[PDB]
Paper text:
Therefore, we wanted to know if D262 from CysGA was important for catalysis, so we altered it to an alanine or an asparagine (D262A or D262N). No gross structural defects were apparent. Both complemented cysG deficiency, but the altered enzymes produced the fluorescent intermediate, with defects in the dehydrogenase and chelatase activities. R261A, D262A, and D262N retain some activity for both chemistries. It does, however, interact with an arginine that directly binds the sirohydrochlorin, so helps form the active site to bind the tetrapyrrole in the correct orientation. P133G/H, R260A, and D262A are more sensitive to increasing cobalt concentration than D104N, R261A, or CysG.
CysG is encoded by a gene fusion between a C-terminal SUMT (CysGA) and an N-terminal bifunctional dehydrogenase/ferrochelatase (CysGB). The C-terminal enzyme module, CysGA, is homologous to a well-studied class of SAM-dependent uro’gen III methyltransferases (SUMTs) that catalyzes the methylations to generate precorrin-210,13.
Residue numbers in the entry:
A (entry chain B): 1 to 271, 276 to 358, 363 to 456
B (entry chain A): 1 to 270, 277 to 361, 363 to 457
Amino acid sequence: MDHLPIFCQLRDRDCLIVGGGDVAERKARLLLEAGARLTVNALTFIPQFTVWANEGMLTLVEGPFDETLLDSCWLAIAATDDDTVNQRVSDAAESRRIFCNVVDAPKAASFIMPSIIDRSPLMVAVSAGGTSPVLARLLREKLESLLPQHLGQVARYAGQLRARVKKQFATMGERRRFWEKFFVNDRLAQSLANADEKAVNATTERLFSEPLDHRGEVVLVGAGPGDAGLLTLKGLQQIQQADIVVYDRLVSDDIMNLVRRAADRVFVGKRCVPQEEINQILLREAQKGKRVVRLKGGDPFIFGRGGEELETLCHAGIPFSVVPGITAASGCSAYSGIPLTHRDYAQSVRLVTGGGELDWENLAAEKQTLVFYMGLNQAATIQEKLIAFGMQADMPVALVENGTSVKQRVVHGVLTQLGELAQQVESPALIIVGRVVALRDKLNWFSN
Amino acid sequence: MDHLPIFCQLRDRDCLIVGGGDVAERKARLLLEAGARLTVNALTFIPQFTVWANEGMLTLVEGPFDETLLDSCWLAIAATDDDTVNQRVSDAAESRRIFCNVVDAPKAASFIMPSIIDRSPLMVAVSAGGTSPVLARLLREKLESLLPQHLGQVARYAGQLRARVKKQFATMGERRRFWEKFFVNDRLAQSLANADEKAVNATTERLFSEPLDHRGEVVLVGAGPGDAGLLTLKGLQQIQQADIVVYDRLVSDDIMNLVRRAADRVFVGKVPQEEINQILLREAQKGKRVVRLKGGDPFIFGRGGEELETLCHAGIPFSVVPGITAASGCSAYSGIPLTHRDYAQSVRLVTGHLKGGELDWENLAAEKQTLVFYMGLNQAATIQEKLIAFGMQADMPVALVENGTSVKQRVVHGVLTQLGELAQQVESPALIIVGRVVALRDKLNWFSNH
Ligand SMILES: Nc1ncnc2c1ncn2[C@@H]1O[C@H](CSCC[C@H](N)C(=O)O)[C@@H](O)[C@H]1O
Ligand SMILES: Nc1ncnc2c1ncn2[C@@H]1O[C@H](CSCC[C@H](N)C(=O)O)[C@@H](O)[C@H]1O
Ligand SMILES: [Cl-]
Ligand SMILES: [Cl-]
């Protein structure tokens, strides 16, 4: 153990920063966030410091380092470019037994500032003693994605329920299992963050009244179009807490590798499976008291039949929520260099599927970006109908297969080639029609 | 934040523990492992303090509390079962500006001792400030299974290489690129764990020999519509690594809280477009990792294309991270699915703000679609008038979602003949949704009613 981590209470304690540039501004913001009573001593200050000074959030002392500014200080930070000044600061702090950090020389003085993940009152700190700040960042990154943004409010509320938990749950083991489902309960975290004090109370007594091993809910999670980096933080957090994950073929294998190892997996994709068995599967797993994640390709509410699955759950009294995902159109647009809107090119974007028939007159109108989902089989018809209803023959068209994935393929041309272009791709694929398609020559940054 | 975590260097620094029982023993063990010069002042001591005193590892002072023992100290710990004594210690420490922990009273005095995961020199500390020891324990145990034990040897080797990296690589960008490759080479980690110095040396020499991509870059990142949990994993990695983040009014404060503290932030709010272009260009040509952070999705009414065209003209590399557009976010969080079993064949994302141009109202009035108007609040009265005049039924359900996905989300709803009036009950940023799917809110709304 090279350093001892301690969590300091800085509120209304005098602290000194020496320096007044960008580096000192970052440290000053951190200490202000911690509630420090801050003096900043520098030869010159960048504008952010004078702003804070007139707002009375700190004190500025312009001029050379004055060691007597340390006389009632609890922490000192030397944040200048000048090794000689930093050494004067760290020597003066050391003689007064004030913990001191030199930003550009972590091993020079008496404390190191770690990477911080703030979920107050819950806090996580990572440091490798100045050996490995890039590693500390890589870990901080990971932890940021894993810790829900509102976990702190849950932690405060947990403190208030401690006495109730121990009187209800006689044993440490039973308590532990309660806390485990308490700290992952989604409606609790969201009710707390929304100040929905009635929803807090309803979730709170469902947690005390339901059987200890029951934690039944359903979360519809949008997996995005393929690239595992396009999952949301919340979607990752939910699949890390699932007892059961129900997924189909349009959820990428890369996404499924992020699923909690101990979660049961139920594949409902087509290896011809109707929708009602899926609705039933979700119903029964949740009634078992399990935490069910329904993982869907893209966004659950865009041609995903997500509403159909939730209506099944609504009458049965099963709590549910929805985590939106990147729909295929947004993902393919970004990864093929084809923005769905651009300047004057398109006043609107239409997301359309390939009883009833498409309004071909409507689809042919100018100033649109058309995006066809599940439309490959209708591709030759789309070419002839658009041409037959007045869309200009030179209108650019593109097809994007397996968008955002490492096997993405993008074919392109003009509308008179559309039916022939669709031959060269297979599902899952998008058809994009409109002037924005021509922008791919400049904006394609991904590799085909 | 409730506390500021700091990692203190205690070697040869005087510390004091008051108390001589099991609690004091556990804190003493930590301070001794950190190299502190430790005095323990207590009326009685459990036997482990004798063993340590006999080995010369600390000093015992048997007796009541001696305030003067704090005189040379950097830290103090009150670890008695006597709350009156503990408060005398914390008062004496306070007067001397000595950080002090009262073990049985986390909210009193001036520092808390966190739970520690040791991968020395790598260390992770976790605490809930006494509010929930169970949460800290559960987190501590999960982080423990997440951090491989090889990490300590990797970090130790990195520390040994730091002098060489500084001498061989002139710029900050080059050194960062070296470290990013160093810390994810699994073979190097295994070779360190096996004490295989030939393999360590071979991989190391190859790593120092690789060229580094000296170029700055611009990443367009979609922040999503507000809820910080809706940022993508890749988007988070971009803003946790960026040198500069250029952001707008429509990027929520909670998203900005995920931008790493070391990045410079540049607010381009109220700034015309080609002035933003100029900022991105200037910073990227200086070799920085630039993120342009935009509300929602960058390629849906974001002007994301114009920015990228300027960079392509200048030879600057760029990429795009899509985000959750306002339509998808407000859909999920208001309980209004954008499509549903032949309620809606089609979704139309439309701007309500054009460059003498006018929308194709015949087209927008078509049946069996969901209309979503972006920046249409000021035009809501005209939208109602035109949709009615081109045949949309007067009772078509409509909803307006203000600050969708945030804790301040407000939803108002009604029928098309109320759209102009409903719009005066909300302010920007708001989305207008028109379509039969709006009626599904009563059965699918899970978020709140504000
Ligand atoms: N990675 C991908 N690349 C191109 N198209 C995709 C795709 N993933 C899904 N799609 C499209 O979506 C259709 C299935 S409908 C499901 C759509 C999904 N809810 C979403 O939001 O994207 C496929 O036929 C295909 O047209
Ligand atoms: N959180 C939010 N709630 C409601 N509407 C929002 C919103 N965030 C953005 N918008 C809408 O988006 C408009 C700006 S245009 C920018 C849209 C963004 N690129 C996206 O993909 O969503 C605003 O006028 C408002 O209509
Ligand atoms: Cl480090
Ligand atoms: Cl705690």
